[model samples]
Target: DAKNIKKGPAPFYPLEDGTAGEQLHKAMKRYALVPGTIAFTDAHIEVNITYAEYFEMSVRLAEAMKRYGLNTNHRIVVCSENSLQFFMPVLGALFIGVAVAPANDIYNERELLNSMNISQPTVVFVSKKGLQKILNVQKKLPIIQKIIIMDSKTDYQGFQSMYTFVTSHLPPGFNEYDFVPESFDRDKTIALIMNSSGSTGLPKGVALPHRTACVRFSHARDPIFGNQIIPDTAILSVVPFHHGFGMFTTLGYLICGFRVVLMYRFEEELFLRSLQDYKIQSALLVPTLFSFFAKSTLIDKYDLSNLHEIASGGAPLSKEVGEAVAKRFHLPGIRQGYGLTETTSAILITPEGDDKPGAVGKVVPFFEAKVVDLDTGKTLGVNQRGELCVRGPMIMSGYVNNPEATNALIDKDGWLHSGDIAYWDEDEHFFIVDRLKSLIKYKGYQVAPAELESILLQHPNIFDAGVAGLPDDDAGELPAAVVVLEHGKTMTEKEIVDYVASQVTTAKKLRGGVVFVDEVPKGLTGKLDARKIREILIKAK
Candidate 1:
């Protein structure tokens, strides 16, 4: 079927320095190219770096980081958004072999203090937008030796601004060629981490290797935008690089040469206008963003005809929503993938023309993926549901300073156990059922929480419903429901129960459902934080 679909030409992605970094030592001469290339863009007033320029900025920042203090093993916490300045210093740290811990810009003063207290960074960089937040927490960050402000014009009491250093270092400016590229140890620890579902108490830092990201970038090039991505392409994105979805995708774009048009916030009108105004050809988006665009009446108000490729991550792409997007936009290419931050994103992505109505598709050869029984630790056969485990260059080395957590996640043979449970059809199309930790036990009978959640969505008065287990004396624990009401509609608990009772076994019916004040609690990123929600139910009871 993929062969039948008409497609465009494939682009030749010239190896950086036209030589593989793993195979040979790349000479500094190749660095003569423009730094920001296609990765930079002309923002409202500031010219953002193009992909090439992005890499160059990193090289320069890496050189600059030497002036500051960053030896290997020195932890540096970077709290910023998706801007050229952010990547520049990051790439510099990579070059010098320093490990970086990415703290969320959304964290409060106490939250920031806790992460800093754990990481003990030598210095931290805060963007202008995040200055106030960091300043509020400054008094408590004892391990932080310095603070560098990005895009700051005036003086601050605590640290020197990057704008100040950029002017003083090389007078006007310096290109990627002005400096030598530093060598890095691929196996050496490179990244401290980012939040991976904070609902599990404090989010643990997933210690990752230096070259894991480069490995992920190699296979994820969407054909529609592969070659079109030059040193001049204007790439627009909403996800911050702090998350794996944004971080790895941005890395892939920058390595190939393309400019980034970044927005820290996700506003429908703002996103639409940005795409229309910039004629953005390529973007990596979450499913909800596309749903917002499709379901919104404002869809036709903007011209998004220039959008070349639309790739969905972070959630499954429902066939209804995917088809709706294609029909509405008259789009040719749309792909959905399954991955985790611990794997630097997708291990399995649908190949062109191979996408099924509801499948995650075949595994990318760049990594190894398998499904095995959670209880038995035995490999599952075709089309059988089990826990998915993966091993490859992209897997994180382990959790930082938490050997027990690391051992639990990655085994002696190096397979990283993803908590997601899934099954693949005969054709090798994978479908996720739910998370291992999210299953509900009702009356000694195992119940899939997602199964009920799926049926509950059919209720006309219910906006969204999530199922969990609530403790019960007779049943040990019983099925519980959390619901969001549809706009302009009201529903009673009995109506909701009758709706579900019509579809499933008696054991799967709601036991003592509760309505949530807000939506179900999601972690810093977006995942059902079951642990936190359990606490909510306990308090309510």
Candidate 2:
């Protein structure tokens, strides 16, 4: 049974041996010599920062952090949308061995509280849009002693400005050789706390150590992975920086010396404009954007001749969508990848010149994966559908303060169980069939049905509720609610929809229409019958 397992190709280059911060610092220093090299840009705002400026900003921020009495023991939260300002705080935190937990900027009050409670961050860097929400909840989180505004220059309600903090400090005069990163046990010290939804529907923090981050950087720089785009060329980034896909790719590409064109949020016009104006050669995108490219007539208006290759991850890419995008762009094929927040980013990405229709591709270097029977836990042979399990250095250590969830996800044998149904062929190319977990994937964001159902039940007119994902070509899955309203009480679908929409973030909103049912399907033990719920939703459709 063990012999059926598949291993990745040998690493083309050895993994760097040091802390992530140390390696990143070295790369920054090397790139800074080329003063004109653009490190980050936001064309919407007409802002660009060269490598030299980025280095000085990060170093000065690090020094400011030290002066503020922060150390390796402290944690900080960056709760803001994508911007050039997001990178420095993260880089500064890494330099001195402090863990950085990035919260979703769109999170409402309840969601924010759940996420912040896990990390108990001592300081929070928030944007103007999210400042009010943070202020409302800051009283509850006694751990947060400092608040720093990220976007605005003027301080709000006495909170210090990030701009002021970095500008007030003098730049480090010493050269790269004189700079020393704080040392720690890289394998044990937490570097990032990426948030993910657990099977139980509450948010879980995937605690990634510096070792994992360093391995990701090294593997990303290897010729096998980095050859898609040259170092000097620019790449477009519309993905949120707080996501695992966004955080890792942005940092990895930066360390590899590529210019990143940052987008605050995805606007169709702005995205196309950036691609045409920057002459972007390659991009790492999600399935939703690919769907937009395939369907949007506006795409033809822009000159996208510079775009050649693209990769998709965060959610499964359908064959129809992939084929359409490939035909439209006149490229070889879309590189589809499969990973989780726990895996740090991608454990499997389509290799160069190997573009199967629906396959995610072979296992990546430094990882081993296998498909096992969901019921029996026995390894399956080629073409057998089962749960995918992988083991590698990139796997996260555990969920912070969540031992049970961690134990449930990773086995005693050190294999991390990915609750995704998949199969592999003789060539060892993996294909995702479906998901074993009940989490709904809406535009690459996980929307837990249990979380939605809980919020639905809180409505005054609702008695019981169940939620399921309705298949959508563009969104992958949309959260649909099946509810049993209180007896003798009448409620309209929009009322229920509006109620849930007001409580959760944008992605979790009920995009799929709500249906009123007499009763929710349930098992004898009071568990929701997921199969029955799906069947009912299909019949209603």
Candidate 3:
């Protein structure tokens, strides 16, 4: 029985009573000690906001939301690239008890329409480049009452500028203590409705309550897991603000008093220059960036001696690359962690001073995990590969407006099934072998095959279609399609490929190329046999 279950360190911090917004507000106020201690820097734009300024802006934004009639019952959508302006509304929404749902900036009009319907937000915060998409879709979504541009200072036609809105609503003699956040149930109130392509179907909103954020903050400050992320530490931020990793780190590092150097997108020279000039102490990157650090010749030109802690997640990092990075950078080891949107953040992480080559370390504090046999549904012992299931306080409440998906992912007993094939060693370090889900991971973004197949079915020339991932070294996987056209109807590969590309985001494009098949392999129940589809694509290649 002992070998069947793996438990993390016992919880030491009691759950707080206030909302995550209130908790984060208090932490930010505590760290606003000096006038010039920087809290956030936009590397590309060469702009900086101090801790005092960042805290004050969030309070002002909260006041503006209150004036705009946003309350606990309302929801807001933020569709923008990473910037100081993006975090203003996000943090302010939390302070006023409004659920924030961030949509990917690359989402086309159709994709945006689908996402907006799930949460039914009243206001949309967008960047200049994404403003037209929101305007294009706002006609269909009657719930949306306002549009605020994040990066602009002047109001456009009818859309209000976020900077003008926040600055205009500032109260006289305002202090952090006088601002009381709206009352709400910390455990029940949805603070964030993050998008995830749950095991199947179109993207569903993962509803995480305010309590999830409080729990994550507690775990990050705990001695057993906090590691070297102390106050005033300089960290790099390159992940998109919409992603689960990006949202958590942006909020977590700021609350913990770390100076965050942010980048809108990954530029090789900009990333290196920021790391060198800012003396970044830590960074949480994906496998692709880690591989770059190991092999990129440009790395030698920058002085990266300040960076001591490097962790990779969002996708699998090969053991060979992990070891190579460690040796090349003179790092003690390369830390890796395994998590999903279902669990607010990482449930398993490589502990300090115990970094194995490919293992994703032990379960963190306040979590329990086990590997279950895929066939028998029984718990498996160490070294046996099976589906990973975990129970923890940080797990999501459920998918918003989706009881079916909630029931499918989390069992009645409270254990959330991860659908990942993994096995833990005797040391409690877990290794992720593969996944049972049909979704494809393209550069750390989840692309559901069902979404693409449905899009393909819309074409008149396509009678049948199946989608699968083509293995690639750089990008974890590239989405590929196998199509069957109508009898006597002709469609070129370029046409089909271009059609899908036009409808989806950059990540879902059929970069793996399309193969015309006589028929798509399906089972008696009319379900896609993904194994057969993968094999057919491999043979075609």
Candidate 4:
């Protein structure tokens, strides 16, 4: 019952996403047919890589990858500073049936090397500028055999770029026999490995199938948000293509024939400028970006009326932030959607005015959503808080080669366990209450950090606050407050602690007291990296 999943491959999409959907293939081939429609553009620049050029680029690398024994049996660990080069190499690898494991650029050298080692890539597609980092751990990685340079003038030993290598490139040769794409299987691999960073332990990889890619794309039909008015809509993607959140957005924009303005890095000035210059119709961002923009002086400088939609992921949408943006720019209020890397990027989304201020939204289309007991894993009812789980064809194949973690996350019954804890209201709107792992016990009271954080943000004297469970003698564990005051504001720990106590019930008070600091620590994707925040707290004391 667990492993036997039978579904015929769609006619055209045989290997990845869906074959017969024709949405993505049409968009790509449309550009191929016209080759002059300006498939991608931004700023004063326009990129018009023809279908012929795209095909040639893929074919060229397919040849080289074959000669080097880096074909279907091999995988490439790709990290680049350039999107054009990134996708060419990616499409090239895809053509030759080599999986491209897109690694996050923000990872330290150690994390990079570890992921590369486990994926065991036959080649490393790296930016020419990033050769230094490769040199940092070159001695440690033996599998990253080929080093493909991207958009650079200098030369590195044994390195090559697609632009420099794509040619009539010798004869099609014996390589031609092994190079043609074969029939797709339900289990064939695809680009970009899934990340499981906060699964109650160390990280693991999620194996996303090729057809899983179909879940987000093609013009034949859209799962959500595709229509006539959005035809010329330009998407400003501030999100990273590394995580599931960003990857699916990229696919959606591409498949819909929409113009995507890609960003190699997230910079406030760069993001805001693109919104105005490109006349960006929409954006997919996390709440942290909205929080920054709502308060920024830059927000007033840009003409942002062109923005029609803004989607938030990575964490809950602060209803306050959403309202502030709508009031400030008159832009549409934000939508809070939910998905984990394990279940593609979106499983639940907000409907039109159906967006209840604090709710995460309703169950997504073409999927089954349930709130289950975190401890017992039983189905939970609406208005009840429990771990959110999703079951869909879009769920990942498994944790790459790690059957253990895959089994734990997606049960034999075919459900994807979303670590985020949530509750569905009477209206069927899903609101993320907290994380199952983050629930804190206070004198037998269930204290959710989200509830306290939301209340804390209301304090006039407070700028930002993070609440967590602190060990207590009599109560077992108590709510602890670590606050970041507004620039130049001054308040002692007692004043802040008492202010909170006055706002809540006796048991919910911050018995662990207050820790004041100038800044709060967060991870690469934000959401308060509590370990680092607590470490800073202890050091300050």
* Pairwise lDDT winner, candidates 2 and 3: 2
lDDT (CA) per prediction: 0.64, 0.81, 0.81, 0.63
The positional error of residue 24 in candidate 4, measured at the CA in angstroms, is 4.5
| Higher-scoring candidate on lDDT, 2 or 4 | 2
Output the better candidate (1/3) by lDDT: 3
How do all models score by TM-score? Answer: 0.75, 0.81, 0.81, 0.75
Weakest ten-residue segment in model 4 by summed lDDT: 2-11
Of the two candidates 1 and 2, the one with more favorable TM-score, higher being better, is 2
Query: Across residues 333-447, which tens digit of lDDT does each residue of candidate 4 receive?
Result: 7766776777766666666455678777766545667777767977777578877777876788877778877787788889777655677776667787533247668878877
* Candidate 1 lDDT: 0.64
- The Cα error of candidate 3 at residue 423, in Å, is 0.8
Alpha-carbon runs more than 4 Å astray in model 1: 1-36, 42-46, 50-57, 153-158, 166-178, 220-232, 434-509, 512-541
lDDT of 2: 0.81
- Ten-residue region with minimum lDDT total, candidate 3: 522-531
Model 2 collision count: 0
Q: Write the per-residue lDDT of candidate 3 for residues 200-246, one digit (tens) a residue.
A: 34778888999888887776665555544565588887777776777
Q: After superposition, which runs of candidate 4 have C-alpha atoms over 4 Å from their true positions?
A: 1-26, 42-56, 63-68, 104-106, 153-158, 168-180, 218-230, 265-269, 298-301, 435-477, 480-541
Q: Give candidate 2 misplaced runs (Cα > 4 Å).
A: 153-157, 167-177, 227-229, 435-541
Alpha-carbon shift of residue 360 in model 2 (angstroms): 1.4
Which digits, one per residue and each the tens of the lDDT, describe model 1 over residues 70-166? 6776877788866656666666676666777776667777777767666678868888677777766666665666778865656556557765554
